[PDB]
């Protein structure tokens, strides 16, 4: 998602808390967007069922 790593620990174990918020913010946004898409699909499919 444009962050340095997909391993959360490796970002934590290499980049400092003055700057690591920028990468983990990207990770938050990407994973939250995936949850949005998944549950919107589930709602439409459930209405159909």
């Amino acid at each position: 998602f444009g962050a340095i790593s997909s391993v959360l620990n490796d970002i934590l174990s290499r980049l400092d808390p003055p700057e690591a918020e920028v990468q983990i913010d990207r990770l938050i946004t990407g994973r939250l967007q995936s949850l949005q898409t998944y549950v919107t699909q589930q709602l439409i499919r459930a209405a159909e069922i």
């Binding site: 400092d16 808390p17 003055p18 700057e19």
Partner: protein, 193 residues
């Protein structure tokens, strides 16, 4: 605050809490005497119109080569052992050279700084303890031994030294804002209601 005779060491930093007064930050901004004037949470042009709870002037003197570490989020010896600023800082840093004020050819060995420390300090923490630090795996007692050192160490402050190595007087303002009945602001007239 500014025109004092002599500032203290960085690990014995002088903290003054100023309250119940009328401040004018414009003339503070409008002097070129301060080599570096940089704020982090407020833009200085707005600083004529903000009302704060009570303000903190933290003052010391350092070597000029360390003024990069005074920013929040920095690391380094000064930044990690004797002086720490928190990353949610709402305030300003101010620095100037005082080569013609407190730099002596005989040597200003009055100004120590902490060179060794067991573990990094809290933000806004002041340490004063001077027990000797053991560097090796060997424990030490008394005052001196192999691989066991005094944590405090002095600057070679003489004006014949190069750039940065002259002393630089540093004052940090750490006002806290918009959570209380504010006290200190404003050369601004209140209109009628």
């Amino acid at each position: 605050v500014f025109n004092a005779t002599r500032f203290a060491s960085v690990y014995a930093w002088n903290r003054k809490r100023i309250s119940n007064c009328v401040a004018d930050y414009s003339v503070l901004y409008n002097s070129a005497s301060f080599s570096t004037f940089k704020c982090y949470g407020v833009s200085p042009t707005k600083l004529n119109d903000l009302c704060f709870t009570n303000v903190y002037a933290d003052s010391f003197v350092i070597r000029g080569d360390e003024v990069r570490q005074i920013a929040p989020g920095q690391t380094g010896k000064i930044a990690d052992y004797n002086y720490k600023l928190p990353d949610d800082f709402t305030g300003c840093v101010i620095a100037w050279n005082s080569n013609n004020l407190d730099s002596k050819v005989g040597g200003n060995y009055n100004y120590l700084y902490r060179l060794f420390r067991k573990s990094n300090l809290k933000p806004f923490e002041r340490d004063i303890s001077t027990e000797i630090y053991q560097a090796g795996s060997t424990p030490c007692n008394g005052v001196e031994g192999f691989n066991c050192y005094f944590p405090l160490q002095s600057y070679g402050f003489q004006p014949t030294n190069g750039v940065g190595y002259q002393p630089y007087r540093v004052v940090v303002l750490s006002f806290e804002l918009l959570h209380a009945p504010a006290t200190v602001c404003g050369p601004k007239k209140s209109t009628n209601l």
